[PDB]
Design a protein around this nucleic acid. Structure first.
Ligand code: K
Ligand code: K
Ligand code: K
Ligand code: MG
Ligand code: MG
Ligand code: MG
Ligand code: MG
Length: 76
RNA sequence: GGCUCUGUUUACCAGGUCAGGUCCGAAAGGAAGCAGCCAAGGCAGAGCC
């Protein structure tokens, strides 16, 4: 069950992306990391400000996560 | 009802500490602040008033 914890560990095998991507996840709660679909507008705003990013950066991380979760489902 | 103890629970919506990330600064230095943790609140059991 590929989640943001798994993704975060993949980001830990950029700081031009990797450190910033890790930071966004580091502003999340464990429920958010476990079930990223619950992250809607208000949680995105909290995560963005808490990581010094914009909401569009959070959107981009979530999209990258989503693409990886789709690919892991299919490779498996 | 109050207080205490114990268990549990709680993204943000004036608490503390604030990793990471962020901001200001040439630096020296500063600042805001999410997660966690802590406090506190919620739900209960027990004890006391
Ligand atoms: K308690
Ligand atoms: K905090
Ligand atoms: K920090
Ligand atoms: Mg809080
Ligand atoms: Mg605070
Ligand atoms: Mg720091
Ligand atoms: Mg600078």
């Amino acid at each position: 069950g590929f989640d943001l914890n798994d993704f975060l560990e993949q980001l830990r095998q950029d700081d031009k992306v990797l450190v910033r991507m890790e930071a966004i996840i580091n502003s999340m709660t464990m429920k958010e990391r476990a079930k990223p679909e619950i992250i809607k507008g208000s949680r995105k705003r909290r995560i963005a400000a808490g990581s010094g990013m914009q909401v569009q950066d959070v959107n981009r991380l979530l999209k990258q996560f989503d693409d990886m979760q789709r690919m892991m489902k299919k490779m498996k």
